[PDB]
């Protein structure tokens, strides 16, 4: 049974936008996007589908790059390291459930290894943007 996607839109909570958000979803997500591994990151985990054991139970926090892009489409974030997160979590998640050296692993490891590179050319400065 899987659960609803997470949510994209938060109808009480602070809805926001910056120049650094604003890199994420214009330069390193499109790189991502883009990327060779990038398709089993580009939706939620069907666990159900490929028979993934307890994977709900261990995974407390379900993340994919599909929900990370409407969240930023949607100024769900209110900065750009709470972006980060939902990446680090992401990738973590793959690192816990699976074995080290698994060729799901490896696509997300490589996958991190471009996000790593691309979020170090956001701006140093926030600024916001008139939304
Ligand atoms: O559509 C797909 N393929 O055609 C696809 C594949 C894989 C994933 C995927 C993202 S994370 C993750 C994961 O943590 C473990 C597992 N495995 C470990 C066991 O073998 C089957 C895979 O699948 C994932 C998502 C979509």
Not at 22 to 41: D, E, G, N
Not at 53 to 73: A, F, N, V
Request: proline share 9%.
């Amino acid at each position: 049974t899987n659960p609803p996607p997470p949510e994209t839109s938060n109808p009480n909570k602070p809805k926001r936008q910056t120049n650094q958000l604003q890199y994420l979803l214009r330069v390193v997500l499109k790189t991502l996007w883009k990327h060779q591994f990038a398709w089993p990151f580009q939706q939620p985990v069907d666990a159900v589908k490929l028979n993934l054991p307890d994977y709900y139970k261990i995974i407390k926090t379900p993340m994919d790059m599909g929900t990370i892009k409407k969240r930023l489409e949607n100024n769900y974030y209110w900065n750009a390291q709470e972006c980060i997160q939902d990446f680090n979590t992401m990738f973590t998640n793959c690192y816990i459930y699976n074995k080290p050296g698994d060729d799901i692993v490896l696509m997300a490891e490589a996958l991190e290894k471009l996000f790593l590179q691309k979020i170090n050319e956001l701006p140093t400065e926030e600024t916001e943007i008139m939304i």
